[PDB]
């Protein structure tokens, strides 16, 4: 539980790191993305507006904001490295889990040379993917509007976050209330912290659980659909679809996984009598 | 969930004629598609062991059962890393899939839950 | 010198009123005062320091 | 077992700042290590802050 | 103690004027009946483990609510399980004994984790006293089996769950069980035992495998934790005169910071040694022992010589004064034994389970100087003397030296 | 319902107190004295214990040998013990040997020789006792505990006294001690078992009538101790077992909190790994200690004196690297007496004590000790009905109030003996006497 | 420097009449101004102990010497933290300043140095 919980914080730190780094370009998407995302803080009751002006260092996103985002963008990766180390130290008490979900205390292998050389394969596969993007299609994953200098007057046609934040943006849109939307968006990440509680299984992991595997498949594909819906226009019928997908996202944690894991426990016991 | 819960709920189902008529065939199919038998496991080999209660139950296993469990875990680990399935005598047959651990963990848990209850007793 | 039941002399240090509430309260007054100044000092430090992030004078001049 | 000893993360802090066994007779010249840690913390806090305003 | 019978179980109770009752179950299951070495000790330690109606844990938590206490011990003749409680809580304790005798689970984990470790600590605590060891070793030499079996479970001979389960099948039976209630209304106990112990097996009387045979010899238990020496004389015909002789020869002081006026006490003058004469009646055989402990092997050796001399001197001539002193010390010893709950239970237990009528302390026979000297003479002229040395055994006496 | 304790006085002021039991055949008669080592000064410290030796060394009539013989002929035994506030001399005998035993006790107390030759002989015996208590670890620990808790005060002195005094105690100062202290108004003749009260009173009139009365007769159990938070460390790496006592200033016999403190003590309770039932006890500390193998044993105590007491715990452990945990968890359970205890723990402990106070008295010697102790500390025997009412009056909220003024954030006296490297310094132990979360 | 070297050099000086005439008085003044005796130390208490050789020498001390050394270290530590000096019987007198450890460390080092030499022997 502890390495997983620290991991959830690593994920939040990565989001903040990447968001601030994107602003540093100070193109149109940089400015307008910063504007809309920082305005979500205005939803904090009573002090929300004051906090936004405090974060900006002024009355809109400008020079003070850019300079502080640079300093914090530099810092945050060091904080992230520390938390990455912490989650590994926490893991070291139990060791790695494995795909069968059973103990490995019966049959251990040294990290080196076995996993050192196995890691090299994926390092080179990664570097091949890296090469194809960096050298042959360097702008495929980006937005053309970020090659336009920031202009507070002109609003871009569509203000979308970077692709990796899109599912959370879809979750925010699903809730009509401002504060509601912000809470839901944050809850979508913090709800990962309750997996240790809501998974009622007596068995670790999904390798032997057909129903859990199907549920997992639907959960993952729903998360991808949320991603797609984060970048469509706020138009029919995507508005209602985004709401249904948001309900499904949360119901995985709150309803489906607790029910499915309870039933599978019973099926394992009765089925093997 | 505690093994106790799982066992009690299952027994409620097995008592009800209607309930058993529906659940028992589903459970048997589930177990067939689960495919743990194709790695030579018994169902009880899959139960999470990293808990004080389960570590205590495992220490109470008869040495023979304990040695055989170790072999099944090592054998399954070898099938897993090789991406192979058991064949022949390595496949767990339905009649071999015995609940060797359930009685031990039920006793461990019975005491642990009684202890929790008795820690909360109120003299009347 | 030999007997361990003869406690060494602690009379130069011992307070007569060592068991009284007044005795304990005095030392907690010192601890409490130290905690009080540390809280006041931390608050002042945090407030003054973090105010650097609020709009600077040149930004407020253009508002 | 006390949590500060049981939990591996807490135990690392414990081993350096709490249960760490020290000689009983360190004099005031053993205080410069913690002053250096203080200088480092001040420089990080003030330096990161200057970086928010410096070009 | 009004002896009666309730549903095939012998029940003895004596009402009193106290808020405290002792209820004891005496079992014919002591070590002379042990099928396997140490099994009686293990069975004793298995009392009040998990039963089918009530877990060990639940029993202990409820015992604390009554403020009751539990005492168990094993002898060569009995296992004794005693509870001490407030008078009114009698039904609970009767039912608890019934659960133990009828429905003990006997689980392997209890044996490994609970029972055997407690049995091992019990023995190590007793062995801290080298005099205990010496007297145990002396019984082993003298009788070999039966009375010669060890009372306690030892590591070198492990008791299995099957051993204990088999022994309990024999022992936990109407034929081997006596119930003794101190400060318990006799009519009330009979009614309760009659309802609670009705479905207990009848079983059969447990017996000693083989007849009691007497042997002489030596045991040399090398320890590093103190020095003791027992001089025992096996008795083929146990007679009550040996009690008087044991108390006469004496050994412990009746007074603080003193030696004592007993012959054996006077054998220890100038030495930091203690001595104790004891007589053990086991019905069909007996043991007369003189145990000497001390820190110096040289002093023990010195006392041992004077001790056998004292016994020879007694065989020569006792005075009338000394014979009266023996009667007084023996009557007192009998009285305090009948008062102490542990020994009391076993005394009446013997009367119920065997048929040996208890000798009331007020009926303890006065032995003339003739009868006492004759008793000591037989012992000095024994063909089978036993000597058990414990500690620095190279420096302690041998049988042929004594 | 036990038979009523009868009580009579003589003219000199000697109390006679008796409890008959027509079911037994033996009787314990003896003299309980409201006097002990605490009555000595620093110069004659050890006198009370010295006298106990010489009481059995011969009288004006019977020599040492005649004394031995007289008791041997009676059939029972004599016993004596001297504590800080109490001296006892008793005789266990047969029912009809009671007149002999009263006569012997009266002789050794009033008419003891205290011959220079015997003083000189015992002076070596007692010197050897100084180097052999060293083995009785519990006694070593508790004697240092008193020495430090009552630093430089009469309760802080040992019973044996210093080596120097043993060499210089004279028959003069022995005589002076027993003349000043062993007075009729401070003495109780006690009979338990097969004794008739009326017979015992007659024997008292025959043997103890010429006892001195004190000039100023105060009531029995009449006494200022100033507790010192402090520690004694007797580290010995060669010992396998650590022995640790921790105490706070407790309650006197006549405190209004006497029963409250007993209930608090029973909530923590005792533990011994060698007893089969101990792993199943309800006490939270018992559970922590047994599950984690932190100790071989612990024993809660609440020791009372006339004007003070010590309340605490005695621990023994082989787990030398987790002494810190053992002490930590012990003091955190004490914290809960202030912060957390409710009717659940209190009613459980009261149930256990209502029986325990009666169970303890199971033989004539225990009964006599109970009568004698109560008469010399309270001036009366408290009936079980009164004791049941006083226990019933203790509420959870009395326990909380008591613990908050007696335990919470208070100075402790701490003694460690053996491999105690793992026992932290005084501050870290004393810091566990409160909870920052509360 | 090894204790061996220190002892050997010192012995060369003590042999030489002229050398000893100059060095012994200086060494005695040095030791007086050093002031370790004012904390109740013996000279050998100051020798660096955190080496394999010295740990071995300390283990070979007779138990009494070992117990006394522990007390001197604890006592000196207490003087150090209190900023006090020894008084009275706590001050080490010149006659009490015995080389209790030197023979043990010289034996440990003799073997260690012989081992080093013999590891480099060449059959002729
Ligand atoms: C920079 C940031 C500011 C923070 C301040 C940190 C400074 C603290 C520190 O390490 O120095 C204090 C420090 C006090 O430390 P201490 O722990 O009391 O003593 C350390 C030694 O034992 C002290 O040695 P001692 O016990 O032998 O005492 C001698 C010393 C100190 O005398 C004292 O009594 C103090 O007296 C002198 O000042 C030397 C004589 C010079 C005369 C001209 O002062 C000195 O030791 C000064 C002497 C240095 C030369
Ligand atoms: C798209 C939907 C994916 C569903 C996966 C279902 C299982 C399957 O077939 O996978 C093959 C394998 C099956 O592996 P296995 O370990 O269950 O089985 C191995 C073979 N046997 C059963 C014989 C032992 O599954 C994986 O390897 C799953 C890894 C999951 C990674 C998902 C990344 C998505 C990121 C979204 C984050 C939020
Ligand atoms: C830098 C900011 C400092 C914040 C201190 C604010 C108040 C806390 C304080 O003084 O701590 C006292 C308290 C208590 O000090 P204490 O531990 O000496 O007192 C405990 C005993 N009683 C409760 C009976 C007084 O310390 C803490 O709670 C720790 C927090 C300090 C950081
Ligand atoms: C800077 C401001 C000062 C520190 C702020 C804390 C306030 C102090 C009051 C609190 C206090 O005394 O309570 C203790 C808290 O101290 C503590 O827990 C902390 C003790 C002192 C903290 C400083 C540590 C070293 C400082 C040097 C800097 C290190 C370099 C890194 C920059 C409890 O503690 P107790 O055990 O005495 O409890 C005793 C019983 N509960
Ligand atoms: C900078 C980002 C991260 C790095 C460098 C990192 C690195 C690692 C490494 C090297 C391991 C051990 C090998 C492996 O299983 O892959 C590991 C395991 C783990 N990480 Fe991460 N991680 C990161 C982020 C996260 C996040 C965001 C989470 C959770 C939300 C997480 C949770 C875990 C868990 C639970 C394990 C143990 C998995 C197991 O072996 O069963 N980590 N991580
Ligand atoms: C060991 C830690 C550090 C030391 C010794 C140090 C030292 C210095 C020094 C000597 C200066 C010149 C100051 C002046 O005269 O104006 C300076 C300037 C600066 N430092 Fe650092 N520094 C440290 C850490 C940092 C960190 C972590 C940052 C984070 C960015 C930082 C940012 C700056 C900036 C922006 C300036 C220029 C503005 C100015 O002069 O004040 N420093 N530093
Ligand atoms: C978790 C911590 C909670 C959030 C921390 C809050 C951060 C910002 C809080 C307020 C900072 C600005 O708040 C403001 O502080 C400055 C000093 O710093 C004060 O200013 C005051 O002192 C300064 C100098 O010290 C003077 O120049 C000024 O004339 C005077 O008004 C203001 O009276 C206060 O309104
Ligand atoms: C200084 C700021 C506080 C943060 C702590 C500093 C981070 C550095 C910690 C990581 C380095 C590993 O640190 C290492 O941890 C273990 C346990 O935690 C310590 O181990 C020590 O303590 C534990 C119990 O406290 C014992 O089991 C062990 O016998 C002892 O050696 C090591 O002596 C230390 O070197």
Short mmCIF file of C-alpha atoms in Angstrom, two decimals, chain E residues 27 44 54 57 73-74 94 105 148 237 250 273 285 340 369-370 377:
data_model
loop_
_atom_site.label_atom_id
_atom_site.label_comp_id
_atom_site.label_asym_id
_atom_site.label_seq_id
_atom_site.Cartn_x
_atom_site.Cartn_y
_atom_site.Cartn_z
CA UNK E 27 -7.28 -38.10 37.30
CA UNK E 44 -1.81 -31.89 32.21
CA UNK E 54 -15.32 -23.07 24.44
CA UNK E 57 -9.08 -17.84 24.89
CA UNK E 73 0.10 -30.40 38.32
CA UNK E 74 1.25 -33.95 37.56
CA UNK E 94 -18.25 -27.87 36.92
CA UNK E 105 -9.93 -30.61 20.54
CA UNK E 148 10.62 -44.85 37.59
CA UNK E 237 6.53 -53.03 52.03
CA UNK E 250 14.22 -34.26 59.80
CA UNK E 273 24.36 -27.29 53.12
CA UNK E 285 6.30 -49.68 46.98
CA UNK E 340 -2.81 -27.36 51.45
CA UNK E 369 11.30 -46.08 70.19
CA UNK E 370 11.40 -49.82 69.44
CA UNK E 377 17.63 -50.72 61.03
#
